[PDB]
Tab-separated table of C-alpha atoms in Angstrom:
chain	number	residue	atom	x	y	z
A	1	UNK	CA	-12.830	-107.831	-182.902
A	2	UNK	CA	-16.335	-107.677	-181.455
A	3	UNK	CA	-18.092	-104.145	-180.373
A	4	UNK	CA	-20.800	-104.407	-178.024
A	5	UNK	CA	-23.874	-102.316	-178.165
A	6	UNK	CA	-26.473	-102.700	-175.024
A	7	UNK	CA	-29.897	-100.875	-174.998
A	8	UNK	CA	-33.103	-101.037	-173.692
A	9	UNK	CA	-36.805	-99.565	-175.057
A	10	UNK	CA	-40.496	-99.891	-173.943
A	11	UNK	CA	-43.607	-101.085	-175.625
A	12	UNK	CA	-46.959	-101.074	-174.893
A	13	UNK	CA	-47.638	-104.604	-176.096
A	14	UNK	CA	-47.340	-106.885	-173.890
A	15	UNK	CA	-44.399	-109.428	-173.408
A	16	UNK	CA	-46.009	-112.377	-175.374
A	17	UNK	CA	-48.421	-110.651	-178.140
A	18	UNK	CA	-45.227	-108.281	-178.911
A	19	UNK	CA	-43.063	-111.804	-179.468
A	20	UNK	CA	-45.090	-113.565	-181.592
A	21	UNK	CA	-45.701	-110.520	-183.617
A	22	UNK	CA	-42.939	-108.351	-183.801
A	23	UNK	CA	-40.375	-110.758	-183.165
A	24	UNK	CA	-41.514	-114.426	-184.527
A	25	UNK	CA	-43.628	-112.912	-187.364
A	26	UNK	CA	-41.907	-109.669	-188.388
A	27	UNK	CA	-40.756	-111.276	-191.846
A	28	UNK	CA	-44.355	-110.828	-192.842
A	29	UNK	CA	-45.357	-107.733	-190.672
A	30	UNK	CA	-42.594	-104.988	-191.145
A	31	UNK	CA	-43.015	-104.846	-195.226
A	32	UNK	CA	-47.098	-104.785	-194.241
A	33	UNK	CA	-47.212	-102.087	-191.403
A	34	UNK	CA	-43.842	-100.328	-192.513
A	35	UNK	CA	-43.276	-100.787	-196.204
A	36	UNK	CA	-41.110	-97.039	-195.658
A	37	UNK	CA	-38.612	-99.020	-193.808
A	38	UNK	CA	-38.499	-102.221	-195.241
A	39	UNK	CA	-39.881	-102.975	-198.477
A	40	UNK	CA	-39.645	-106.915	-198.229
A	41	UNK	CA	-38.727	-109.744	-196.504
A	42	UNK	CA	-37.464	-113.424	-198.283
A	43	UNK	CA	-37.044	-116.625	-196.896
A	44	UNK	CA	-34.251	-117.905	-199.070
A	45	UNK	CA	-34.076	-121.072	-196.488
A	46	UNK	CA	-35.489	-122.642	-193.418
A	47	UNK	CA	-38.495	-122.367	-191.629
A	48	UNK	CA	-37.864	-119.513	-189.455
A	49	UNK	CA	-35.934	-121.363	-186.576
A	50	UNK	CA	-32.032	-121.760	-186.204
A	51	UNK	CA	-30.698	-121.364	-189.381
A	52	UNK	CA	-33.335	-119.870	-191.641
A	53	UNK	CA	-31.609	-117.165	-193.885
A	54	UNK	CA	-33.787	-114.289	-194.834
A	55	UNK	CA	-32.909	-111.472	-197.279
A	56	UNK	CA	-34.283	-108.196	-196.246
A	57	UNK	CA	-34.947	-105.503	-198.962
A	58	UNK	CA	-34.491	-101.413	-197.684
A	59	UNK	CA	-36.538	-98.960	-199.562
A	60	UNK	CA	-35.176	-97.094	-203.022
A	61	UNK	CA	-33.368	-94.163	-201.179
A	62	UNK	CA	-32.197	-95.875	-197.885
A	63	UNK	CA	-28.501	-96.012	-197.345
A	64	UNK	CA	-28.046	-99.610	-197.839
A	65	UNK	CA	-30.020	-102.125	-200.636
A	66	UNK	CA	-30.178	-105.072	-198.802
A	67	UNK	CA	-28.775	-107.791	-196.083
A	68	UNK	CA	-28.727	-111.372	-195.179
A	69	UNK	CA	-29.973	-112.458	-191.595
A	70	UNK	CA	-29.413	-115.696	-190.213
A	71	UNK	CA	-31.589	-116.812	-187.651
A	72	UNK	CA	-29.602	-117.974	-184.202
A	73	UNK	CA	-31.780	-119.184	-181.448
A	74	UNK	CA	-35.709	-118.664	-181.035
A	75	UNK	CA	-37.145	-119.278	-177.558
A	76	UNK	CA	-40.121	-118.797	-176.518
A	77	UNK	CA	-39.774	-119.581	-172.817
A	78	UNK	CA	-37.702	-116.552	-172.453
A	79	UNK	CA	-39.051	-114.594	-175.168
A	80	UNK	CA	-35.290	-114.584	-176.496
A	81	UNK	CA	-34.564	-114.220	-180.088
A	82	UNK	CA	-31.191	-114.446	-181.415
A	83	UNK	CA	-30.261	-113.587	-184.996
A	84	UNK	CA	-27.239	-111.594	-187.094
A	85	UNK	CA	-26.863	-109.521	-189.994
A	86	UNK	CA	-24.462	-111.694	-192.012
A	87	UNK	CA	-24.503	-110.662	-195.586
A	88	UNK	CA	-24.887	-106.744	-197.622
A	89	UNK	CA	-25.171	-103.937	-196.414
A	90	UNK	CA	-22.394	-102.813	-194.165
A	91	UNK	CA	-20.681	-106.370	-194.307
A	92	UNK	CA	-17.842	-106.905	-196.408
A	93	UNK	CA	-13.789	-106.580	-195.763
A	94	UNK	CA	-14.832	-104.210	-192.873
A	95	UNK	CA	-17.489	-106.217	-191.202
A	96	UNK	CA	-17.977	-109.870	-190.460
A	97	UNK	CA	-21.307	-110.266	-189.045
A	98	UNK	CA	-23.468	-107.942	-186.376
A	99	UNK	CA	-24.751	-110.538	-184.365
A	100	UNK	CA	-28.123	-109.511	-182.065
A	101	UNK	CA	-29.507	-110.831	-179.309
A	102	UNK	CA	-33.449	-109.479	-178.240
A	103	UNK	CA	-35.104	-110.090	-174.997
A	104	UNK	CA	-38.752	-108.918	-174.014
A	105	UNK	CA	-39.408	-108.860	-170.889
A	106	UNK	CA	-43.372	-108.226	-169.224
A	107	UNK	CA	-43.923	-105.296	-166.623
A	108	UNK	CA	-46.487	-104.912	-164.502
A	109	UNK	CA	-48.275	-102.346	-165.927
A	110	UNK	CA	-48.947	-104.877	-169.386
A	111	UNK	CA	-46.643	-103.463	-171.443
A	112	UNK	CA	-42.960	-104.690	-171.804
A	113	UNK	CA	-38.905	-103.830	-172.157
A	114	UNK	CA	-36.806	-104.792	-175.579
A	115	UNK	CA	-33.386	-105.693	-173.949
A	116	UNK	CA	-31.370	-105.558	-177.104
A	117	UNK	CA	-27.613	-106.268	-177.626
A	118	UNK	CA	-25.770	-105.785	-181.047
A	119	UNK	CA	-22.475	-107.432	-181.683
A	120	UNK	CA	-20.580	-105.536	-184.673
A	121	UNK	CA	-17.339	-108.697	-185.466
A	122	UNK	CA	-14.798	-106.968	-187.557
A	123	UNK	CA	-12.311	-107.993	-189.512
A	124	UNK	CA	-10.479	-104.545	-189.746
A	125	UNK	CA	-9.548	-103.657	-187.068
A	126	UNK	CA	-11.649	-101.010	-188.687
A	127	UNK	CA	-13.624	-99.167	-185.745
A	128	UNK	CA	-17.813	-99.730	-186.030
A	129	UNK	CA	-18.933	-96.209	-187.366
A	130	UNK	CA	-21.285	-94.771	-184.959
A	131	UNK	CA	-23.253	-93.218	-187.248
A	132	UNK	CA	-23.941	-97.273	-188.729
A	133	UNK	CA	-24.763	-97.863	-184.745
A	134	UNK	CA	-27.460	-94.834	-184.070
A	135	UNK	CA	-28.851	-95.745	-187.511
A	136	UNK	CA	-29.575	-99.785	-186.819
A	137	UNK	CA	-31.421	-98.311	-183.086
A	138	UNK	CA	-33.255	-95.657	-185.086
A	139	UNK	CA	-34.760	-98.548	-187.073
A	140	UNK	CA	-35.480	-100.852	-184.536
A	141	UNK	CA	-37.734	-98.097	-183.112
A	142	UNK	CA	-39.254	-97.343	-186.126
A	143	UNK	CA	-39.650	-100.845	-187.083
A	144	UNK	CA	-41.222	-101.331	-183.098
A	145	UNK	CA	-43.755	-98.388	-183.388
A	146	UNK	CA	-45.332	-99.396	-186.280
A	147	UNK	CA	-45.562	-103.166	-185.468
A	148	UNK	CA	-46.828	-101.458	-182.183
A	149	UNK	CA	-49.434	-99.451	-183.815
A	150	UNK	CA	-50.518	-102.004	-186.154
A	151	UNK	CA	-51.267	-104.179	-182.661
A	152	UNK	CA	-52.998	-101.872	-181.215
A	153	UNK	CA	-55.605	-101.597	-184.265
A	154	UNK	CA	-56.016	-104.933	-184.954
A	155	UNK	CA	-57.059	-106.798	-181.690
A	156	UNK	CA	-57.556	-110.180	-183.057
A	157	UNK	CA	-54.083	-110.502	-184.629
A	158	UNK	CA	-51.499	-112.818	-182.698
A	159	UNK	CA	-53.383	-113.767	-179.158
């Protein structure tokens, strides 16, 4: 069955910058600005649009090794990007795929909002662990404040 998980932060990039960066280029950033939360990102295949399979490496120590992510849907019109966990980690005879759905949206202030929804598909009907929940939000923030800080430093980077 499919869990739904809905929740919103802020950033202090704005809308676009934070898209291009964070979102469209964080295969190359996160192992650069947070190498303590990801160690490294490979394209197995694709270009980074729908379809593109990337296998993301955790640090030794983390709780899980690695996964597979898929890329869904990238548009930049909306600032949308759509993509789901589909391999390692926490998939297996539990899981079938967490499937995520990002949306940045500008405020007026020049700074924007992360709309994020997470879509845990089991096979089960094993309930989603809420502990494997608060953990995938607590690294999307991490992952966000040092893509954020990184931004913030180094001006010239994605305008």
């Amino acid at each position: 069955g499919v869990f739904n998980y809905e929740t919103e932060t802020t950033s202090v990039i704005p809308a676009a910058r934070l898209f291009k960066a964070f979102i469209l280029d964080g295969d190359n950033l996160f192992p650069k600005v947070a190498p303590q939360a990801i160690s490294s990102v490979e394209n197995i295949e694709g270009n980074g649009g729908p379809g593109t399979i990337k296998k993301i490496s955790f640090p030794e120590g983390f709780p899980f090794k690695y996964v597979k992510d898929r890329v869904d849907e990238v548009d930049h019109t909306n600032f949308k990007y759509n993509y789901s966990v589909i391999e390692g980690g926490p998939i297996g005879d539990t899981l079938e795929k967490i499937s995520n759905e990002i949306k940045i949206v500008a405020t007026p202030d020049g700074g924007s909002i992360l709309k994020i929804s997470n879509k845990y598909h089991t096979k089960g009907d094993h309930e989603v662990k809420a502990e494997q929940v608060k953990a995938s939000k607590e690294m999307g923030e991490t992952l966000l404040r040092a893509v954020e800080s990184y931004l913030l430093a180094h001006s010239d980077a994605y305008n």
